[PDB]
């Protein structure tokens, strides 16, 4: 009875949905894309080497204009650069020394940041003073913040180390919605292009989507081997790729609700700490911890190119909204732009 | 007319370049440390000698030491510790006395040794030397001079262990107290010297939590850490 009874009925649900997944898995992506033309060996050189940081760069984010990319490090300030002419547009100092994430609002007015201080600090950019200042300081999380994203300048989704996600309103400063159902430290959350569902991945090898309105998890996604570090949505909004600490990148399909196909190699030892897609979605991008980065053919599981411009852990990666460039930021306190 | 915005952009970029150079000086002049232990291990008493985390900035002979103690945080340390590969040292405070009575894990030294082993062999913390503080030495002496619970049956290598010839029994105490103290020290040093390849070392001490010399010990250990790093990079050590 009680705990054991619910455990056995939960196992009944588990193998029932496993049987359902096997029934709906009539084929794989490999046998349906084997006749497709491969992208071949591609290469792309560095265009700009953004420099001026001291500590390890932990995150970044482009804007809608794909011109100003944010950057955050453990030095104590967050730098808003310019992709062209490498000029440092802004530099906002931070109260806390280490931050783990940054967010660039689609309007470009607000910039979010946060880290081990357990407080999401959001700064303006177009104040009447002409300088930067603290706009909002969201508090309530008892764990470290790992990733933040912007829907508009009225709502922010923040992923914390409390094994929960949060959706806050800017002016109220309180948790409008709380997302629970996870047991490991939630690391990366990524928003769909329609800005309706966002996928979050914890330290329990499980990534699930959440709806921003009712605040309930709809579909879970298990089948990995270790803690998932980074997730990005497919450009169509019906798939998402997960990288973790086991040298694998699994592409889940939202409608199929199953593991489609996986990217790995025998020589890769370290895990993935940055996953992102291109505009067309044909090119996955993975940043490992062996001082390297690579691009994967998202439909053929064939490596198409290796980028070795960094001499430290590639902790962060980003792709412009128009798909014109790729920015990789590592523990070398550098940022590299490729195209 | 279109050149003026980029002219202002160069002027700005020069301003942040100067500000970042000043910050680079003031930040390379600042030494960061993380204090780590359990709640009963003695974090608060070491902090007392001068948000989920707390900060403490102090000066030891015109040297800016920023010591940070993690407070309201989850016990899963496998991924938020990776932020601390750039600290010059990692202060590790353990409760040497608490080896029984049944308190917390009841094998506090074993848990601390496992945590130290995980920290030492981490692929990102390999470049950070770990200052180690053996707190609660008076309590250990009182509980080991005459106690119902013996450290035996908790560690089966007490019989094959004696006081080392290089030991420093500066305070006149029982030989068993010195034996236990350097036993715990050698248990920590066994994992300290089993890996690292000279990249980082441990600096054990004996903090009684009743003296203000711990900041001086930390300052001396940081000086030794930087001296050893310079010597190794110069191909001398």
């Amino acid at each position, epitope marked *: 009875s009680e705990l054991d009874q619910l*455990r056995q009925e939960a196992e009944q649900l588990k193998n029932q949905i496993r049987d359902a997944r096997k029934a709906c898995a009539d084929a794989t992506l490999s046998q349906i894309t084997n006749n497709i033309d491969p992208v071949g060996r591609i290469q792309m050189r560095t265009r700009r080497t953004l420099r001026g940081h001291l500590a390890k760069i932990y995150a970044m984010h482009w804007g809608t204009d794909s011109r100003l990319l944010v950057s955050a490090s453990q030095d104590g300030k967050l730098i808003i650069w310019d992709s062209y002419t490498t000029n440092k547009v802004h530099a906002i100092p931070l109260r806390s020394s280490w931050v783990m994430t940054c967010a660039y609002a689609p309007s470009g007015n607000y910039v979010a940041c946060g880290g081990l201080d357990n407080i999401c600090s959001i700064y303006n950019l177009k104040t009447r003073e002409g300088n930067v200042r603290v706009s909002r300081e969201l508090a309530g999380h008892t764990g470290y913040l790992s990733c933040c994203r912007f829907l508009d300048d009225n709502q922010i989704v923040t992923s914390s180390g409390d*094994t929960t996600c949060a959706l806050w309103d800017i002016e109220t400063g309180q948790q409008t919605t709380t997302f629970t159902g996870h*047991t*490991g430290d939630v690391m990366s959350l990524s928003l769909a292009p329609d800005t309706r569902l966002f996928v979050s991945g*914890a*330290c*329990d*090898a*499980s990534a699930k989507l959440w709806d921003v309105r009712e605040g309930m998890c709809r579909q879970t996604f*298990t*089948g*990995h*081997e*270790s*803690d998932i570090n980074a997730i990005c949505f497919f450009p169509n909004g019906n798939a998402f790729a997960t990288g973790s*600490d*086991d*040298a694998t990148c699994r592409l889940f399909d939202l409608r199929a609700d199953q593991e489609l196909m996986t990217y790995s190699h025998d020589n890769i*030892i370290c*895990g993935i700490t940055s996953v992102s897609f291109s505009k067309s979605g044909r090119l996955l991008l993975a940043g490992y911890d062996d001082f390297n980065c690579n691009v994967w053919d998202a439909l053929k599981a064939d490596r198409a190119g290796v980028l070795a411009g960094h001499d430290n852990r590639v902790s962060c990666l980003g792709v412009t909204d128009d798909g014109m460039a790729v920015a990789t930021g590592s523990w070398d306190s550098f940022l590299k732009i490729w195209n | 007319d279109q050149r003026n915005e980029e002219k202002a952009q160069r002027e700005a970029n020069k301003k942040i370049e100067k500000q970042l150079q000043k910050d680079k000086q003031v930040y390379r002049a600042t030494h960061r440390l993380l204090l780590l232990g359990a709640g009963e291990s003695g974090k608060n008493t070491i902090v007392k000698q001068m948000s989920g985390i707390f900060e403490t900035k102090f000066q030891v002979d015109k040297v800016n030491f920023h010591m940070f103690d993690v407070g309201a945080q989850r*016990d*899963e*340390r*496998r991924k938020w510790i990776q932020c601390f590969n750039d600290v010059t040292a990692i202060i590790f405070v353990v409760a040497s006395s608490s080896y029984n009575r*049944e308190d*917390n*894990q*009841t*094998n506090r030294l*074993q*848990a601390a040794l*496992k*945590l130290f*082993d*995980s*920290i*030492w*062999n*981490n*692929k990102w913390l390999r470049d950070t030397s770990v200052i180690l503080f053996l707190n609660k030495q008076d309590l250990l002496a009182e509980k080991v001079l005459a106690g119902k619970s013996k450290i035996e*049956d*908790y*560690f*089966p*290598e007490f019989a094959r262990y004696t006081t080392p010839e290089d030991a420093t029994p500066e305070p006149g105490e029982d030989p068993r107290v010195t034996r236990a103290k350097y036993f715990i020290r050698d248990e920590f040093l066994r994992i300290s010297t089993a*890996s690292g390849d000279g990249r980082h070392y441990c600096y054990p001490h004996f903090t009684c939590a009743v003296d203000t010399e711990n900041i001086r010990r930390v300052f001396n250990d940081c000086r030794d850490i930087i001296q050893r790093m310079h010597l190794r990079q110069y191909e001398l050590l």
Partner: nanobody
Amino acid sequence: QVQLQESGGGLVQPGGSLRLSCAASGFTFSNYKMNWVRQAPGKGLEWVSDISQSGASISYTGSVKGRFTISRDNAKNTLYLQMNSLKPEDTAVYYCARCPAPFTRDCFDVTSTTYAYRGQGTQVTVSS
């Protein structure tokens, strides 16, 4: 998904012998360090023992050193623990823990509460 199922155990007279079998499914067993942990009733967790990827490196808690034997087998992906000469102090629940990352010498959160990759474990009680 990672699944660790622990079998064996039960009520056994003190001074006897006992075995636990931890079956691991959903991942590669020949790549992850294995850990056995215990939790006493009304007390915190306590790490029992650990074994490396190939079984070369074996370490035990000093209290159980010489009486516990941990052996892993990667062919059928199973981790066995043998207890000899039980004592009434060793009444506890036992979990078959897991290394967080492949090819990694360290092991961080085996004794941490609400660990993700921890099995249900078995309750072993020794008394009269």
